[PDB]
């Protein structure tokens, strides 16, 4: 339920919606909101099912900005799963 009055469960619901989401724009909005209301902690490690080839993992995670690297990581992983 929305507005849980608890940041932890709010983050849990938000990342659940992130996993469920398929629109890149909505994924971006959810992830940027998460980054804003949390610390500078990487959030691509929120659904272990997500996979990324080891060849491209170095380049994809070799971005200074946590927000941008997480966005690109999630986008490519979700799109590869869809493919």
């Amino acid at each position: 339920y929305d507005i849980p009055a608890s940041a932890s469960v709010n983050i849990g619901q938000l990342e659940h919606q992130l996993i469920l989401s398929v629109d890149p724009w909505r994924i971006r909005q959810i992830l940027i909101e998460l980054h804003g209301m949390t610390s500078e902690r990487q959030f691509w490690t929120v659904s272990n099912k997500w996979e990324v080839p080891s060849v491209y993992s170095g380049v994809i995670l070799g971005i200074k900005d946590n927000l941008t690297r997480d966005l690109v990581y999630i986008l490519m992983a979700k799109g590869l799963h869809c493919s």
Partner: protein
């Protein structure tokens, strides 16, 4: 005499020598002749306070076990109480290896009761040392996995009776459960049929935000528990939450909140556990 016996026992324990075999036999013979439970308990305590943290022993351990058995043969309620107190006072190295070495039904029951009392006192005092002593006692009881269901049932019955100390007793039980892995999960689920829930709700009504946090932690632990019969616990929780079968509306709301919290926690452990490391078994 006692000092010499203790020195011989310590020497045997440290260096595995046979020079203390005859001394141990003579000490055992003298102790049976004395028939002094207090004397035997004191002799065992001296051999474990400092003669048990140096090195493991076999002949000395057997002599100490025989002395403890002689002490416990009689009633000796006071001796057992002082003996349990000396063990908690000197929890050095093999304190549990000595206190739990009795392996007797009555001794184990008394030790469990003393450990429960110590844990309750530690929870009330909110003292780190007391909490550590209570945890050590709980771990010692767990290694002697002979019969803990009666003690757990007695503790649960005592906790629901009160309302002021009920919250503290529940918090202490939940904390020991987090380390004991909730062995009697089925027993814990079964006892709270109709009136235990109401009593616990009344007791927790006097709790505070600390009580709410303790309840959330206990819900997380329970979600990471209930291996033997998880379906029964899940059905009991759902009937009292969605079916509105709870005796109290506050109880039903708490059940719904606990279900949501457990679902969120499982989802965190389920997905955000990490892709690199292996999964955590639920």
């Amino acid at each position: 005499m006692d000092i010499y016996v203790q020195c011989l026992s310590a020497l045997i324990g440290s260096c595995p020598d046979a020079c203390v075999d005859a001394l141990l036999d003579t000490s055992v013979q003298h102790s049976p002749h004395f028939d002094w439970v207090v004397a035997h308990i004191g002799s065992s305590f001296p051999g474990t306070i400092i003669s048990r943290v140096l090195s493991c022993g076999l002949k000395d351990f057997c002599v100490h076990g025989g002395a403890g058995g002689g002490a416990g043969s009689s009633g000796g309620s006071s001796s057992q109480t002082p003996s349990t107190d000396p063990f908690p006072g000197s929890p050095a190295i093999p304190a549990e290896k000595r206190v739990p070495k009795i392996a007797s039904v009555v001794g184990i029951l008394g030790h469990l009761a003393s450990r429960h009392g110590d844990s309750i006192r530690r929870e009330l005092l909110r003292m780190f040392h007391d909490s550590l002593a209570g945890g050590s006692g709980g771990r010692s009881g767990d290694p002697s996995l002979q019969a803990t269901v009666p003690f757990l049932l007695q503790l649960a019955v005592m906790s629901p009776a009160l309302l002021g100390t009920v919250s503290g007793e529940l918090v202490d039980c939940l904390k020991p459960p987090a380390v004991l892995s909730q062995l009697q999960q089925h027993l814990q689920g079964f006892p709270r049929e109709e009136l235990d829930n109401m009593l616990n709700l009344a007791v927790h009504l006097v709790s505070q935000a600390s009580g709410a946090g303790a309840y959330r932690l206990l819900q997380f632990l329970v979600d990471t528990a209930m291996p033997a019969s998880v379906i029964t616990t899940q059905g009991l929780a759902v009937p009292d939450t969605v079916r509105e079968a709870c005796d109290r509306l506050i109880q039903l709301l708490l059940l719904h909140l606990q279900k949501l919290v457990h679902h969120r926690g499982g989802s965190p452990g389920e997905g955000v556990l990490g892709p690199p490391p292996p999964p955590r078994l639920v």
